[PDB]
Amino acid sequence: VSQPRRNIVGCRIQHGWKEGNGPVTQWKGTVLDQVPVNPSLYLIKYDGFDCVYGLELNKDERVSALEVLPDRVATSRISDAHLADTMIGKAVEHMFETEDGSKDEWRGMVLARAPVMNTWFYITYEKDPVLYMYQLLDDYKEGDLRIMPDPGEVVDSLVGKQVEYAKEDGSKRTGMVIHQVEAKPSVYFIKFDDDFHIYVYDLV
């Protein structure tokens, strides 16, 4: 319980966001992790938005003066992990309610249990492929989530490999892989520069 400098992983922060040259709107969130391949990057979750982003909180002009709050993210350990373990790595239908109240479910996959906020859970979706955090316990409890069913280790993962793809406006997404998921080694977290969202992809 000490460290020479930084290590703000797991403690919430507050900073302002400036888009281009627009308004300085104030955001507060929780730092969840840091990536070792390039240690200038942190993962964040903002109170209000279930999504998780990846920002270079100290190497980025866009972020405002960085304030580290004394608020504590109460660990608040989960009652029972039996159900949590049943759904890590599976495929589930996530029920979503439109503002009008109409039904709309997305077929997605529960990647694994989240870090820092333990009740919250990682998830990616098929037609929308980015890293989200939802308290899926609440979901399954109220009935808005259902589960459809289904020797010596090799080199496996290729984290740290830069990748490239083909897009329309004479451009290609350029980023690198940053994580091998424990439940399914096929999928990986990939971060694309000029974008501040974490993508979860199956690279076969």
């Binding site: 966001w17 999504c51 029920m95 979503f96 309610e97 709309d104 979901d139 109220e142």
Partner: peptide, 9 residues
């Protein structure tokens, strides 16, 4: 019961 409106900023 969750909403896609709160997904991101």
């Amino acid at each position: 019961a969750r909403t896609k409106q709160t997904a991101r900023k």
